[PDB]
């Protein structure tokens, strides 16, 4: 078979662990000079960035911060043991354990180095772990930025571990089966105090793709129906074949000579459609696909079949262009041949089905009120254990509605046929015959049909939606003939590995159908928010539908990838993913700012600004703020192109700054000071109208990298005409960049719950409906 | 002197009454049709009708390019009916929506 | 346009009682009638034929 290995090896999930700590910044030290340029005799350590590859456009940089985001959703940790990265302090009074093989790393190259003041040494060797054993909590010590502390204060505190026992084991199976007398479970293992699980998302269908996804629904009812196949039990000791078709030609003493209608009476009885029949009604009945219907109407005993088939089985199973056409067969030839009536007349778009202006014409009361029953016969929806459960009628399951049955067709065999020959009163009072000899069989087969459907629904996690089926899966009417003939003795119920394997299919698709829509939801959502306009959101939802293993996404539309999206954008972020990203909206500043080879604008005034003194540059043209000027948007400019009002402000000499991510360089003399040379780089705007070849200067003037620095005993203050935008590193204060973390000390974690719960059944001579009789108590 | 339209039809408003209308209708049980033929003509209609975010779209991009291509017009757009006729097929508009 | 009549085909099923059951599909091509639709419209609106 082909895709039932797709829904058979939909694996549970992975529990992440996680290994690290999740930094982005680090220190780095670096020269520092005097408040003239001259270089100091030290350095200081600075936080940096890890890696920088923050890119040059001002709408390239949005578009990383969602790189950024999806980054940190992979490394999201379920749980957290915390003593399996703890590794060596170096230097400790008591030989003390540290989080990180990197936060060592830190603590190893301050101590030892020589700049170093002494009680910044003296607070490196008390860094020591504590074990809290009755409590189940450690600590250890940490070295971390701010906004990284964020990130691994909310992965401590918030993670999917809870407590297990035996109890929690044996309330995960569901409760129709706890409550069956037919089942008997033990386990044999006792668990301990530490024992962790992880409980799935059964959150019902939050997209309802049966309302106008059609196509897509009608693939979903198939995966269900060729499921439940599998799982629907194979009848056992069945009446032999060739000892009922010898009994069934003696009732009805086929003749060799005379041509009749009664050898047709002798077609598909084998054993193999007998239990086709069984396992049809049944499985599209739990997926709720349409089932179809067709017969050859030579054949009578297809039509006295099919009134069992639609006294037992609600009538909005079947297409209509099948159901009525058979059952206007039905009553053409043997119920209004009974009382003289005349043909039925019918018109195709009729609004009323042939049992419906049947119970009004015939005057039995035996007969009529038996199609009264076939006529207003419906499922009830009732929500069982918060699943959408279709519960039959209790007169179907009690087994009792074949006595209303057989009451009718003893009335037809006992009217007279006025109008037709005596060869047709033969013919068809035979095949009541027929059926009237098996009556004890018959009220069997309807208790055992029914226990098997309230069986196997109380493993189903979704919503029966009652929607009827595109494609609508085909069922023989001499199948049924051959499952009545043929029933006999043995009771058979599922058992209960197969009733244990039916719903972790059932689990395992559903909980993967919830996490795959948390995890577009918050993609969607976070673009929508991160103003990325030139976004086409055809590739977030076909990644949707490829890990959903169902579908073939090749042969799927367009509208549908953008419809699914319309619908999957007013589902409201998970609670988990969006707290992610209120630490990323809200540092989103701090992280771009905190970079070399990108600045935040460029400021042109044409005065004689004078350049700020810094302790690691020496002498700079860094402004802080955006006060005094105008603003042109560069994005914007980029965006329509317009120029025109950007050729006026740079020919007429009036006072910009423009802003906007902007690659710069470094320029480090003060001959190139002294020749103006930055305001150079701007005449290339009016002569090419693009902006993306704009790139600034930055002046250092130190005392080293500077080439000789002599100048500047002159007493002269150096000036400018042209600044940047872009901020001043954060220094590393070694003691109040310390944390500490909470986590527990040991636990364990256990999946597939049912691997502990072994389960026999009664005999199954002595299965016990539901009325606390017996199914199939007939000798 | 030139020939143009609603702003209806500029912008896409217009088809979101098409929706409505011909949603309505996606429901009429359709009294003395045969539910075969009455279910692929219901089926049919939401073959368009789910389309809609595409063809407000779509006669959106058609009313800015008849607008920008008549700016080049000098002679008046007289109107009158021509003796012989340019001939559509409605398998063309079938192919233009879907 | 090879995953766009496929939906077609299957949403109306085309064994109901129609004759034509083929001939009711000829718009599988796109870039010569949904181009020469495009190209129909506009130009018989600004000469107005």
Redesign the interface.
């Known amino acids: 078979e082909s895709i039932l290995k797709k829904l058979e090896d939909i694996k549970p999930e992975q529990a992440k662990k996680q290994t690290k700590l999740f930094r982005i910044f680090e220190p780095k030290q670096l020269p520092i000079y005097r408040a003239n340029g001259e270089r100091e005799l030290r350095n200081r350590w600075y936080w940096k960035l890890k890696r920088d590859t923050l890119p040059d456009g001002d709408y390239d940089v949005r578009e990383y911060f969602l790189n950024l985001y999806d980054q940190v959703l992979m490394e999201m940790p379920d749980y957290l043991l915390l003593k399996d990265m703890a590794v060596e302090n170096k230097n400790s009074r008591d030989a003390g354990k540290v989080v990180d093989s990197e936060t060592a790393a830190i603590c190893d190259a301050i101590f030892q180095d020589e700049e170093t003041e002494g009680a910044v040494r003296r607070f490196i060797a008390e860094m020591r772990q504590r074990v809290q054993a009755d409590r189940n909590v450690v600590n250890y010590p940490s070295i971390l930025h701010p906004i990284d502390h964020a990130f691994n204060e909310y992965f401590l505190q918030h993670q999917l571990v809870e407590p297990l026992n035996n109890d929690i084991i044996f309330n995960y199976i569901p409760e129709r089966i706890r409550n069956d007398v037919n089942y008997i479970l033990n386990m044999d293992r006792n668990l301990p105090s530490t024992a962790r699980y992880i409980r799935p998302n059964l959150l019902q269908d939050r997209l309802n793709l049966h309302d106008?996804f059609?196509?897509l629904w009608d693939t979903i009812t198939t995966s269900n129906y060729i499921l439940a196949r599998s799982v629907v039990p194979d009848l056992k000791e069945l009446v032999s074949t060739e000892a009922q078709i010898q009994k069934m030609s003696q009732d009805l003493q086929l003749e060799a000579l005379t041509i009749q209608s009664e050898t047709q009476f002798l077609t598909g009885i084998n054993s193999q459609a007998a239990n086709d029949c069984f396992k049809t009604l049944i499985a599209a009945m739990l997926s709720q696909r349409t089932m179809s219907l067709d017969f050859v109407t030579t054949n009578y005993m297809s039509l006295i079949s099919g009134m069992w088939l639609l006294t037992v089985i609600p009538n909005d199973m079947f297409i209509?262009?099948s159901l009525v056409a058979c059952q206007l067969a039905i009553i053409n030839t043997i119920v209004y041949p009974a009382f003289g009536m005349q043909r039925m007349h019918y018109?195709?778009?009729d609004?009323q089905t042939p049992f419906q202006i049947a119970e009004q014409q015939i005057q039995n009361f035996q007969v009529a009120n038996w199609l009264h029953f076939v006529n207003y016969n419906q499922f009830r929806q009732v929500v069982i254990d918060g699943v959408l459960n279709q519960v039959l009628n209790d007169n179907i399951r009690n087994g009792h509605v074949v006595n209303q049955l057989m009451e009718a067709l003893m009335q037809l065999s006992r009217q007279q046929f006025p109008t037709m020959p005596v060869d047709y009163k033969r013919s068809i009072q035979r095949g009541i015959l027929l059926l009237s000899n098996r009556l004890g069989q018959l009220v069997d087969l309807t208790r055992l049909l029914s226990y098997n459907y309230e069986t196997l629904m109380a493993c189903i996690t979704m919503n029966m939606q009652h929607v009827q089926t595109?494609t609508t899966e085909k069922l023989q009417l001499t199948s049924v003939t051959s499952l009545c003939m043929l029933i006999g003795n043995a009771t058979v119920i599922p058992s209960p590995q197969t009733l244990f394997h039916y719903y972790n299919v059932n689990v395992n698709f559903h909980s993967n159908y919830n996490e795959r829509i948390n995890d577009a939801v918050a993609i969607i959502t976070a673009a929508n928010r991160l103003n990325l306009y030139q976004k086409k959101m055809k590739s977030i939802v076909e990644d949707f539908l490829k890990r959903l293993q169902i579908f073939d996404v090749?042969?799927?539309?367009?509208?549908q990838m953008?419809?699914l999206r319309?619908r999957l954008r007013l589902l409201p972020v998970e609670i988990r993913r969006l707290d992610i990203f209120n630490l990323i909206a809200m540092n989103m500043e701090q992280i771009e700012r905190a970079s070399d080879k990108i600045a935040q604008g460029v400021i042109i005034a044409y005065r004689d600004m004078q350049l700020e003194r810094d302790e690691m540059y020496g002498y700079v043209n860094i402004a802080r703020n955006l006060d005094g000027f105008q603003q042109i948007n560069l994005e914007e400019l980029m965006r329509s192109g317009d120029y025109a009002q950007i050729t006026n402000m740079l020919l007429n000499n009036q006072p910009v700054a423009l802003v906007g991510a902007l690659p710069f360089i470094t320029d480090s003399s003060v001959i190139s000071l002294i020749a103006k040379l930055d305001a150079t780089v701007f005449a290339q705007i009016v002569k090419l109208r693009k902006v993306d070849t704009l790139k600034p200067i930055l002046y250092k003037i130190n005392s080293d990298s500077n080439d000789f620095y002599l100048v500047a005993n002159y007493d002269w203050i150096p000036t400018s005409t042209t600044k940047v935008y872009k901020q001043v590193p954060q220094q590393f204060d070694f003691r109040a960049s310390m944390h500490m973390l909470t986590s527990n000390l040991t636990f364990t974690v256990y999946s597939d719950l049912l691997a502990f719960v072994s389960a026999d059944t009664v005999e199954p001579i002595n299965a016990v409906a539901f009325d606390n009789m017996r199914i199939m108590n007939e000798l």
Do not use: H
Request: no cysteine; hydrophobic share 15%; proline share 11%.
């Open positions: 106008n059609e196509s209509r262009e018109r195709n778009g609004p595109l090749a042969r799927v539309p367009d509208d953008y419809r319309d």
